[PDB]
Scaffold this active site. Structure first.
Site, mmCIF file in Angstrom:
data_model
loop_
_atom_site.group_PDB
_atom_site.id
_atom_site.type_symbol
_atom_site.label_atom_id
_atom_site.label_comp_id
_atom_site.label_asym_id
_atom_site.label_seq_id
_atom_site.Cartn_x
_atom_site.Cartn_y
_atom_site.Cartn_z
ATOM 1 N N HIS A 174 0.823 -1.212 0.000
ATOM 2 C CA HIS A 174 0.000 0.000 0.000
ATOM 3 C C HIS A 174 0.855 1.258 0.000
ATOM 4 O O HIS A 174 0.527 2.234 -0.684
ATOM 5 C CB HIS A 174 -0.958 0.003 1.189
ATOM 6 N N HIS A 229 -9.355 -1.887 -4.820
ATOM 7 C CA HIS A 229 -8.225 -2.162 -3.936
ATOM 8 C C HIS A 229 -7.251 -3.132 -4.580
ATOM 9 O O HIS A 229 -6.035 -3.019 -4.373
ATOM 10 C CB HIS A 229 -8.655 -2.731 -2.587
ATOM 11 N N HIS A 287 -0.578 -11.152 -4.778
ATOM 12 C CA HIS A 287 0.820 -10.755 -4.609
ATOM 13 C C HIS A 287 1.772 -11.788 -5.195
ATOM 14 O O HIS A 287 2.787 -11.426 -5.803
ATOM 15 C CB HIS A 287 1.127 -10.524 -3.132
HETATM 16 C C1 LIG Z 1 -3.998 -9.725 0.822
HETATM 17 C C2 LIG Z 1 -5.011 -8.586 0.782
HETATM 18 C C3 LIG Z 1 -5.897 -8.569 2.046
HETATM 19 C C4 LIG Z 1 -5.090 -8.472 3.365
HETATM 20 N N1 LIG Z 1 -6.028 -8.615 4.489
HETATM 21 C C5 LIG Z 1 -6.803 -7.566 4.894
HETATM 22 C C6 LIG Z 1 -7.701 -7.682 5.884
HETATM 23 C C7 LIG Z 1 -7.860 -8.956 6.528
HETATM 24 C C8 LIG Z 1 -8.860 -9.106 7.617
HETATM 25 C C9 LIG Z 1 -9.095 -8.076 8.520
HETATM 26 C C10 LIG Z 1 -10.024 -8.228 9.533
HETATM 27 C C11 LIG Z 1 -10.735 -9.409 9.640
HETATM 28 O O1 LIG Z 1 -11.667 -9.568 10.654
HETATM 29 C C12 LIG Z 1 -11.686 -8.566 11.706
HETATM 30 C C13 LIG Z 1 -12.816 -8.901 12.652
HETATM 31 C C14 LIG Z 1 -13.123 -10.214 12.959
HETATM 32 C C15 LIG Z 1 -14.169 -10.495 13.822
HETATM 33 C C16 LIG Z 1 -14.915 -9.471 14.374
HETATM 34 C C17 LIG Z 1 -14.612 -8.155 14.063
HETATM 35 C C18 LIG Z 1 -13.568 -7.872 13.202
HETATM 36 C C19 LIG Z 1 -10.513 -10.437 8.748
HETATM 37 C C20 LIG Z 1 -9.581 -10.286 7.739
HETATM 38 C C21 LIG Z 1 -7.116 -9.999 6.115
HETATM 39 C C22 LIG Z 1 -6.149 -9.885 5.047
HETATM 40 O O2 LIG Z 1 -5.447 -10.805 4.638
HETATM 41 C C23 LIG Z 1 -4.373 -7.221 0.539
HETATM 42 O O3 LIG Z 1 -5.030 -6.212 0.424
HETATM 43 N N2 LIG Z 1 -3.016 -7.245 0.458
HETATM 44 O O4 LIG Z 1 -2.434 -5.957 0.231
HETATM 45 S S1 LIG Z 1 -6.204 -8.934 -0.614
HETATM 46 C C24 LIG Z 1 -7.539 -7.685 -0.475
HETATM 47 O O5 LIG Z 1 -5.411 -8.738 -1.982
HETATM 48 O O6 LIG Z 1 -6.855 -10.374 -0.347
HETATM 49 CL CL LIG Z 2 -1.643 -14.921 -6.578
HETATM 50 ZN ZN LIG Z 3 -3.948 -4.569 -0.250
#
Ligand SMILES: C[C@@](CCn1ccc(-c2ccc(OCc3ccccc3)cc2)cc1=O)(C(=O)NO)S(C)(=O)=O
Ligand SMILES: [Cl-]
Ligand SMILES: [Zn+2]
EC number: 3.5.1.108
Length: 300
Positions: free
Chosen positions: A79, A238, A265
């Site tokens: 990011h 995103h 990634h």
């Molecule tokens: C790889 C990714 C995503 C990265 N990421 C982001 C958020 C969470 C993530 C956050 C919070 C979560 O739950 C919080 C919660 C649980 C119970 C009750 C209340 C609150 C679950 C999950 C997990 C995760 O891995 C990306 O942006 N990398 O740059 S992506 C969009 O490309 O999959």
């Molecule tokens: Cl991948």
């Molecule tokens: Zn991201």
């Protein structure tokens, strides 16, 4: 005049927590000389460990892009690097007091605001661009990531989540970044995760800092965040933000088009590595007259 390399005008500071580690971290962004690139610095270590934000230093790509050197890591660089790429910052030192970049609000919004508050500074050296000359692609199963030639910079992305909050929604988007659309179009698109996964994630030392304050949290049948989305297509935007940051591990701005299909990634890193090896597919270019270049930049 020519398109010049840019660095920061003044030092920028931010505090936060790592999304995956949950650890408090102090971030300091500093100006750097011409042809430095973006270099991360673990200043909690003595002597410091410096890791250039380059494809060759990517280690793990599980749920984030992680830079590695020796036994040391800098996690979740995508990011901040997306903000650097989006603002055209060539050279900068990124100091961290811990092993992960602060997640902030989950987007690149806080970073672009903090940087643009301080301002950029042009340097007396030509900005170098990597121009895609022919198609380069990687695939794994149904996932795909492609570079194709394009007179400008454009990113398209398609996701395909078998989930009731995603079915029937806009899961594809394309954005042209040949002008100054990054800030408006994608900078504020937040990361996202699934409540169902949080116990597994935490057992892997992932998402330990994740909350509705820094991510869109998706439950089984609804978004948990009470305050709503910043864009109706925030999820796919995103993914575009992530791709811009991962692509900036090439070390220069891109002249070309990226297309991602269910990629992330890991495949982004594999695409960069095969591009770098496929030298006939790209060239390095400069512009002695900004008026004739295919990408335009904001004033510093
Ligand atoms: C790889 C990714 C995503 C990265 N990421 C982001 C958020 C969470 C993530 C956050 C919070 C979560 O739950 C919080 C919660 C649980 C119970 C009750 C209340 C609150 C679950 C999950 C997990 C995760 O891995 C990306 O942006 N990398 O740059 S992506 C969009 O490309 O999959
Ligand atoms: Cl991948
Ligand atoms: Zn991201």
């Amino acid at each position: 005049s020519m398109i010049k390399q840019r660095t920061l005008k003044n030092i920028i500071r931010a505090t936060g927590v790592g999304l995956h580690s949950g650890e408090k971290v102090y971030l300091t962004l500093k100006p750097a000389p011409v042809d430095t690139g973006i270099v991360f610095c673990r200043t909690d270590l003595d002597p410091v460990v410096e890791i250039p934000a380059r494809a060759e230093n990517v280690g793990e790509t599980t749920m984030s892009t992680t830079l590695v050197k020796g036994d040391v890591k800098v996690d979740t660089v995508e990011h901040l690097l997306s903000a650097m790429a989006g603002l055209g910052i060539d050279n900068a030192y990124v100091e961290l007091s811990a092993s992960e970049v602060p997640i902030m609000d989950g987007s690149a919004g806080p970073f672009v605001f903090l940087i643009q508050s301080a301002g950029l500074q042009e340097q007396e050296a030509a900005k170098k661009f990597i121009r895609i000359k022919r198609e380069v692609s990687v695939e794994e199963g149904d996932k795909r990531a492609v570079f194709v030639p394009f007179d400008g910079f454009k990113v398209s992305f398609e996701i395909d989540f078998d989930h009731p909050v995603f079915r029937g929604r806009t899961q594809q988007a394309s954005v042209d970044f040949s002008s100054t659309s990054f800030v408006k179009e994608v900078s504020r698109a937040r990361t996202f995760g699934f409540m169902r996964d949080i116990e597994y994630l935490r057992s892997q030392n992932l998402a330990l800092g994740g909350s509705v304050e820094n991510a869109i949290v998706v439950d089984e049948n609804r978004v948990l965040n009470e305050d709503g989305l910043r864009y109706e297509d925030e999820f796919v935007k995103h993914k575009i933000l992530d791709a811009i940051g991962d692509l900036y591990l090439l070390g220069n701005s891109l002249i070309g088009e990226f297309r991602g299909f269910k990629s992330g990634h890991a495949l982004n890193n594999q695409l960069l590595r095969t591009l770098i090896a496929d030298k006939d597919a790209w060239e390095v270019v400069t512009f002695e007259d900004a008026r004739t270049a295919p990408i335009s930049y904001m004033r510093p």
